Design an enzyme around this catalytic site. Structure first.
Site, PDB file in Angstrom:
ATOM      1  N   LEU A 256      82.193 -42.644  57.343  1.00 23.32           N
ATOM      2  CA  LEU A 256      82.309 -42.121  56.501  1.00 23.32           C
ATOM      3  C   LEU A 256      82.886 -40.774  56.749  1.00 23.32           C
ATOM      4  O   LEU A 256      82.745 -40.106  57.804  1.00 23.32           O
ATOM      5  CB  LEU A 256      81.260 -40.889  55.567  1.00 23.32           C
ATOM      6  N   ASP A 257      83.991 -39.964  56.394  1.00 24.27           N
ATOM      7  CA  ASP A 257      85.741 -39.232  56.026  1.00 24.27           C
ATOM      8  C   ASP A 257      84.259 -37.608  55.799  1.00 24.27           C
ATOM      9  O   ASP A 257      83.315 -37.951  55.923  1.00 24.27           O
ATOM     10  CB  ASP A 257      86.819 -39.362  55.655  1.00 24.27           C
ATOM     11  N   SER A 258      85.547 -36.592  56.445  1.00 22.64           N
ATOM     12  CA  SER A 258      84.459 -35.167  56.678  1.00 22.64           C
ATOM     13  C   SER A 258      83.858 -34.644  55.241  1.00 22.64           C
ATOM     14  O   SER A 258      83.960 -34.198  55.070  1.00 22.64           O
ATOM     15  CB  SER A 258      86.226 -34.738  56.988  1.00 22.64           C
TER      16      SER A 258
ATOM     17  N   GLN B 182      81.337 -37.683  53.305  1.00 18.22           N
ATOM     18  CA  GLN B 182      80.251 -38.110  53.810  1.00 18.22           C
ATOM     19  C   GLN B 182      79.251 -37.278  52.568  1.00 18.22           C
ATOM     20  O   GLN B 182      78.173 -37.564  52.364  1.00 18.22           O
ATOM     21  CB  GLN B 182      80.001 -37.268  55.236  1.00 18.22           C
TER      22      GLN B 182
END
Ligand SMILES: NC(=O)c1ccc[n+]([C@@H]2O[C@H](COP(=O)([O-])OP(=O)(O)OC[C@H]3O[C@@H](n4cnc5c(N)ncnc54)[C@H](OP(=O)(O)O)[C@@H]3O)[C@@H](O)[C@H]2O)c1
Ligand code: SF4
Ligand code: SF4
Ligand code: SF4
Lengths: 75, 111, 206, 106, 111, 147, 313, 176
Positions: free
Chosen positions: A35-37, A40
């Protein structure tokens, strides 16, 4: 806590861009799941609405795994 | 007849609406808006209480209107009954209404 | 001179005393450069403290300005530091005009004039809209001279006069007014610049 | 009698003398070598002597105000607030801050 | 330490997250209160692509300036202001050209 | 045949008789639009009655400069008008910016937002020239409904 | 019955021909030419509006309401045009058992036209013009009945037929001197074209019972709102004016009655042009605070008078 | 200078109080205000109906643009790009090519009515006095294309207004 792991896993599985069977219990959402920053911690924000308790900004950074999130949910 | 007089005026009034309802028709697009008058999108959607400001002055009318209805005998009742016995009672209702308005002077309200 | 000169300098000597008076305090925190020309005074101020300078000129017994009416900002890319906020001040009891300036690049936040002046906040909204200069501890920074969904800042010299998003068609969509169309009519760029310097003394050595 | 501003001209003498005597003590706490103390004092001492000399005449109000005593009192009322703010934020006494880039000519 | 902007390098990352939470809760509220427009599911994906274009992170001065700018264009529906279905729509609807091919763009003749 | 053809002109005679304008306080053109109400050059019950409200009026006069902040506002007002509607863009701002045109905020010519039937070119739109904006409007209404 | 049909069609024309006077007299009051182009003196323009607003103009509100809204212009005309029936005239259409009671009841029922137009649009923008229209009418209904009672006790009973016979030598303006001045203000309780008025005209706020309505319902509102102005003008010419009766010759009465009413018809449009709006709060302070103690003191005065000197019908 | 808006109470005792109370009790001054517009109704209106009567004007007035010509033929415009530079709207466009042999006067000459604020600048800046502003009012079109002026032609068709221009310019030389 009794009846906490079952409720949190049901809400996370229903959410988009998540594996239905591959990632469950004691697995990192950013490291293991992928997942991305911003993506997530976005799943953790949706989980707060299902339980019925507001989550602070400082405690949200520490949580990543559903096993770790279940312990922080209890008050 | 009172019934035939009132209905003929009412039926002619509603018939004029039908003339303005069915004759002008060509297109009805998603063009009509909620607030109008000044323009822009409505910030206050549907309905919200607002209220207050005139809450005391409006209530007093409902109380005063009953007394004016009780003043309506004056030109129609004073024909058979004794005037000297009535004089003390007829003025009595008007005097006390001025007393209630005198109590209305000491802080009238927000209005 | 009958029609050559506008006015003779007589109050200029008295106005020069103001340029010395504030300089006699001598702060590196405030003063820096003092310029005075054509019956007026100009002071530029170090970015770190602007609020203590604004409390001065206001209230003070010798110089009672108080009214900080007009508030401008300069757009210039020649210097290393870009924008320059310029305060224009006026006295009602003293009857004089003085100028307050800032020198910083001010892409980074600058001190606000809202605690000192009550109408300055509306002028502060104009600067953030047109230039993009944020004011620290500002109450309600709302957009005035910009569109509700506007990208960038509409006054900057770095971007064109016509703008990126400007043309608004109704087209095929029933109610939604378009934005992404960018083409406009041709503004003739005048490349005129006259040879020979018009004025002496203004010439700077390389 | 009524003043021009919203603040009503109350009949009070020596009231102006209290505020001007208060600010003189405030100045003599932190700055002494700085010019801010030395320059503000000579204006206040000249103004206080004019109040003592004139006995409640309109000529006392005409001395560097000319809008009655009420307008002069407003300058004295905000004088204590600006003097306390000047002592709180160090600028008058200290001078050590950095200077801007060499460019000025347009 | 010039200039402050708002927060340090690491603290700036969680300031955007705090802004993200408030705007993530507004996309169901900008349909029922405002207009139908498109969709709730497609609206959330329009939010995610906006932050991905802005994602760089090199200076605290740049990041904190985006937060204040984000607290106006996304605050346009927080206190409920008029946009009239023309504003707030970030993605182009009437703009259909997306050509990235040396073969595609050169056939249309550009630059 | 002949009664049908004359009845269509009778409906069009009502628009030839009277048309109510909209008080678009948009710029300096709106000041000369107030001069239409001024006695020296009058259309007051000559064929124009000021009342405002976009729902009641027949003709809307765009009186000045339009911007991107105003483009969604004016559009639905035209939609709030009854279907037999006429737009008179009066002034150089209404025709494509007085100056402007190459500016960032100003929408060019009103026709990008709302279609226009009668154009008035005048910056300070002289009341003498403004009178055509209503008289030519009545003259342009010639024929409606053949079948 | 033919009389009712001969009291709607020529009466709607009187509300139509009012539009001339609404900008001819008001025009010359403001030094401007009114109707001129359309007819010989613009006389073809009032009848042109009936062709303009009904046949071609189509609007129905957006968000709207259900059956109500379009019910309101039916309530506008069907309660204000019925007011013509109890009028005494030379001869009344079905002379009421008590006259003025029907006149006062249906006038308050006519207020509902601007009330139901508040719920015409579900949006809150329209109902502000309705809530303002409540207070600008609700307070003035108090004195409207009281000042009537002081006149009615002075002369006859509630029956409107007796009010013509009571004025044989002199008018009722002279005995009821402060009360006649009140009926230039109290008549403007309903949303009428005036300076006192109510929330109906534009000026400051949005137009009440017009911003929600079209053209066709909105056009039907003016045919009722301006109709009430004539109605109050005739009603003042019965209660305060009279001059002569003459039952033998109806021709001598009909000419003389119209001139008295027409002088009052100009007087309300005279008021409209001359003075600004009284404000929502301060109109509630003109009456109630200031005028209600004055009217009740005169009501107290008019109770004693028939007892002091014989005055009983 | 001080004019003072405050009256400082006109009423004092007996006579000055009762007359100030009489106007507030009934009306009087409102009836006096009613009589102010009474006399205004009696006096004639200063109204001008357009299709027959016309309003007052001036010898120097600007309307729709029209270019002039010499008494013995020839285009008076010389093509400079002067009036192009003065134009704040930049409505006037000019491109020039040599006319067959000898004379060099214009090819492209468009004045857009989409812009143009009507300054009289181009009327003043022109050294040969080509653009002379006439007393025009009548201009109404269906489209923008019909509104904006083409390469001279319609501007050359200012001959119908050039007879008035020649009379107006007689007030222009040795100004007023
Ligand atoms: N139902 C559907 O949506 C559907 C389904 C499948 C295919 N299609 C196809 O798509 C097209 C849709 O068009 P539409 O029905 O939307 O067009 P439309 O509304 O009928 O409009 C056609 C216009 O052309 C004019 N016109 C046509 N025939 C004329 C004649 N004989 N004389 C004078 N004027 C004439 C009419 O003017 P006046 O009104 O002034 O006479 C009318 O304004 C059709 O041609 C059809 O083949 C439609
Ligand atoms: S066209 Fe001229 S008068 Fe009209 S709004 Fe524009 S600048 Fe003002
Ligand atoms: S109009 Fe006059 S200034 Fe303009 S190009 Fe022609 S001659 Fe030159
Ligand atoms: S009048 Fe002014 S704007 Fe118009 S063409 Fe001449 S210079 Fe340009």
């Amino acid at each position: 806590l009794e009846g906490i792991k079952d409720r949190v896993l049901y809400v996370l599985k229903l959410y988009d861009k998540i594996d239905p069977e591959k990632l469950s219990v004691n697995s990192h959402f950013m490291k293991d799941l992928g997942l991305d920053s911003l993506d997530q911690v976005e799943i953790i924000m949706a989980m707060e609405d299902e339980f019925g308790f507001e989550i602070p900004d400082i405690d949200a950074e520490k949580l990543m795994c559903p096993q770790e999130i279940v312990d922080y949910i209890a008050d | 007849n009172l019934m035939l007089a009132l209905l003929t005026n009412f039926t002619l009034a509603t018939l004029l609406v039908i003339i303005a309802f069915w004759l002008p028709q060509l297109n009805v697009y998603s063009e009509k808006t909620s607030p109008y008058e000044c323009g822009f999108d409505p910030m206050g959607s549907a309905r919200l209480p607002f209220s207050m400001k005139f809450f005391l002055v409006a209530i007093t009318f409902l109380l005063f209107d009953l007394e004016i209805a009780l003043l309506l005998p004056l030109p129609w009742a004073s024909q058979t009954a004794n005037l000297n016995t009535m004089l003390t009672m007829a003025l009595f209702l008007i005097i006390l209404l001025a007393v209630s308005l005198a109590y209305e002077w000491t802080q009238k309200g927000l209005e | 001179r009958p029609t050559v000169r506008p006015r003779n300098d007589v109050a200029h000597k008295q106005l020069s005393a103001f340029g010395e008076y504030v300089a006699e305090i001598l702060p590196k925190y405030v003063q820096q450069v003092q310029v005075s020309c054509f019956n007026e005074l100009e002071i530029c101020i170090h970015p770190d403290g602007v609020i203590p300078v604004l409390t001065f000129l206001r209230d003070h017994s010798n110089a009672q300005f108080k009214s900080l009416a007009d508030l401008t900002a300069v757009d210039i890319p020649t210097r290393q530091n870009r924008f320059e906020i310029v305060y224009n001040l006026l006295s009602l009891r003293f009857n004089s005009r003085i100028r307050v300036k800032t020198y910083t690049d001010e892409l980074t936040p600058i001190e606000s004039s809202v605690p000192v002046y009550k109408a300055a906040n509306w002028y502060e909204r104009e600067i953030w809209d047109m230039f993009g200069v944020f004011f620290a501890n500002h109450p309600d920074l709302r957009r005035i001279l910009t569109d509700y969904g506007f990208e960038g800042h509409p006054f900057r010299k770095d971007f064109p006069l016509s703008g990126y998003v400007e043309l608004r068609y109704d087209d095929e969509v029933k109610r939604v007014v378009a934005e992404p169309v960018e083409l406009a009519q041709e503004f003739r760029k005048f490349d005129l610049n006259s040879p020979w310097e018009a004025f002496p003394a203004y010439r700077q050595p390389p | 009698t009524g003043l021009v501003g919203l603040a009503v001209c109350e009949t009070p003498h020596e009231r102006l003398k209290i505020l001007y005597t208060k600010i003189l003590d405030v100045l003599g706490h932190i700055p002494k070598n700085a010019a801010y103390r030395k320059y503000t004092e000579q204006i206040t001492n000249e103004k206080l002597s004019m109040v003592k000399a004139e006995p409640d005449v309109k000529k006392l109000e005409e001395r560097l105000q000319g809008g009655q005593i009420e307008e002069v009192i407003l300058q004295a009322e905000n004088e204590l607030s600006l003097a306390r703010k000047m002592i709180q934020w160090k600028p008058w006494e200290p001078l050590v801050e950095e200077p801007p880039a060499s460019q000025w000519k347009w | 330490v010039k200039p402050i902007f708002s927060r340090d390098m690491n603290e700036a990352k969680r300031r955007v997250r705090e802004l993200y939470r408030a705007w993530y809760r507004e996309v169901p509220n900008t349909v029922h209160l405002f207009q139908l427009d498109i969709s709730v599911k497609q609206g959330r994906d329009k939010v995610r692509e906006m932050f991905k274009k802005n994602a760089h992170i090199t200076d605290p001065r740049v990041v904190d300036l985006l937060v204040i700018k984000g607290k106006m264009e996304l605050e346009e529906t927080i206190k409920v202001w008029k946009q009239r279905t023309h504003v707030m729509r970030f993605f182009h609807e009437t703009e259909a050209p997306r050509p990235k091919d040396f073969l595609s763009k050169f056939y249309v003749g550009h630059d | 045949e002949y009664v049908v053809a004359k009845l269509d002109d009778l409906i069009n005679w009502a628009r030839r008789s009277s048309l109510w304008p909209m008080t678009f306080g948009l710029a300096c053109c709106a000041v000369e639009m107030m001069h239409m109400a001024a006695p020296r050059y009058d259309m007051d019950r000559f064929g124009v009655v000021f009342r405002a409200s976009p729902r009641q009026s027949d003709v809307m006069i765009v009186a000045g400069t339009l911007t991107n902040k105003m483009a969604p506002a004016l559009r639905k007002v035209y939609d709030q008008m009854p279907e037999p509607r006429y737009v008179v863009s009066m002034g150089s701002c209404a025709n494509g910016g007085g100056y402007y045109h190459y500016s960032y905020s100003v929408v060019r010519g009103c026709d990008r937002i709302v279609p226009v039937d009668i154009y008035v070119p005048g910056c300070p739109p002289t009341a003498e020239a403004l009178l055509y904006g209503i008289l030519q409007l009545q003259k342009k209404i010639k024929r409606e409904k053949r079948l | 019955m033919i009389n009712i049909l001969m009291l709607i069609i020529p009466i709607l024309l009187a509300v139509a021909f009012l539009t001339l006077v609404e900008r001819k007299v008001l025009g010359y009051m403001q030094l401007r030419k009114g109707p001129n182009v359309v007819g010989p003196y613009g006389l073809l323009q009032p009848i042109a509006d009936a062709i303009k607003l009904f046949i071609k103009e189509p609007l129905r509100p957006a968000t709207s309401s259900a059956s109500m809204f379009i019910l309101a212009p039916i309530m506008a005309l069907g309660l204000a045009l019925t007011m013509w029936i109890p009028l005494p005239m030379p001869y009344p259409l079905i002379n009421m058992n008590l006259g003025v009671l029907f006149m006062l009841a249906m006038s308050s029922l006519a207020v509902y036209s601007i009330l139901w137009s508040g719920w015409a649009s579900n949006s809150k923008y329209a109902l502000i013009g309705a809530l303002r229209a409540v207070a600008q009418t609700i307070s003035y209904e108090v004195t409207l009945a009281i000042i009537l009672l002081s006149v009615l006790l002075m002369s006859g009973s509630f029956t409107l037929s007796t009010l013509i016979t009571t004025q044989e030598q002199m008018w009722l303006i002279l005995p009821a001197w402060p009360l006649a001045m009140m009926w230039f203000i109290s008549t403007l309780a309903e949303t009428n074209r005036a300076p006192f008025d109510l929330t109906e005209g534009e000026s400051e706020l949005v137009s009440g019972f017009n911003v929600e309505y079209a053209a066709g319902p909105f056009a039907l509102f003016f045919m009722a709102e301006y109709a009430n102005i004539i109605m109050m003008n005739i009603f003042t010419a019965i209660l305060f004016l009279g001059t002569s009766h003459n039952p033998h010759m109806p021709e001598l009465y009909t000419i003389n009655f119209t001139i008295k009413s027409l002088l009052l018809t100009m007087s309300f449009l005279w008021i409209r042009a001359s003075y600004p709006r009284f404000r929502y709060d301060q109109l509630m302070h003109l009456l109630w605070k200031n005028f209600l103690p004055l009217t009740l003191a005169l009501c107290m005065w008019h109770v004693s008078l028939p007892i002091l000197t014989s005055g009983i019908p | 200078t001080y004019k003072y808006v405050n009256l400082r109470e006109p009423s004092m005792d007996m006579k000055s109080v009762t007359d100030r109370a009489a106007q507030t009790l009934l009306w009087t001054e409102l009836i006096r205000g009613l009589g102010m517009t009474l006399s205004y109704l009696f006096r004639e209106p200063a109204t001008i109906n357009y299709p027959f009567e016309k309003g007052p004007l001036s010898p120097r007035f600007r309307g729709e643009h029209a270019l002039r010509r010499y008494p013995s033929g020839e285009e008076r415009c010389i093509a400079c790009k002067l009036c192009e530079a003065v134009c704040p709207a930049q409505a006037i466009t000019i491109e020039a090519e040599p006319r067959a042999d000898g004379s060099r006067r214009t090819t492209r000459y468009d004045i857009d009515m989409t812009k143009c604020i009507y300054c009289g600048f181009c009327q003043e800046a022109c050294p040969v006095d080509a653009i002379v502003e006439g007393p025009n009012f009548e201009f109404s079109t269906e489209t923008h294309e019909e509104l904006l002026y083409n390469k001279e032609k319609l501007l050359n068709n200012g001959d119908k207004w050039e007879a008035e221009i020649a009379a107006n310019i007689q007030a222009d030389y040795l100004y007023r």
